[PDB]
Design a protein around this ligand. Structure first.
Ligand code: SF4
Ligand code: SF4
Length: 80
């Protein structure tokens, strides 16, 4: 899973880009819901939210280290 850090400028651009609806508006920043973030494995070759973030604040979430296989597996439980 990835996480949006405190440097988020609340620009709204990454929200609509997530295939799993993992990103939502927070009180201070946008937040990714880790159970929904597959790091875009299964849909795209790269993270879509990272691709559009204007200030490079989405990074790997150290408390949710998943392999290409667990992301794949997550992609599979979220979609079919
Ligand atoms: S794109 Fe980046 S700066 Fe904009 S809301 Fe999403 S995480 Fe924050
Ligand atoms: S990496 Fe993909 S699934 Fe995770 S929040 Fe970003 S767009 Fe969504």
């Amino acid at each position: 899973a990835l996480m949006i850090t405190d440097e988020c400028i609340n620009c709204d651009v990454c929200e609509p880009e997530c295939p799993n609806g993992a990103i939502s508006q927070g009180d201070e920043t946008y937040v990714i819901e880790p159970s929904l973030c597959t790091e875009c494995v299964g849909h795209y070759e790269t993270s879509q939210c990272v691709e559009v973030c204007p200030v490079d604040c989405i990074i790997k979430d150290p408390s949710h280290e998943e392999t290409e296989d667990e992301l794949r597996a997550k992609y599979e439980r979220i979609t079919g």
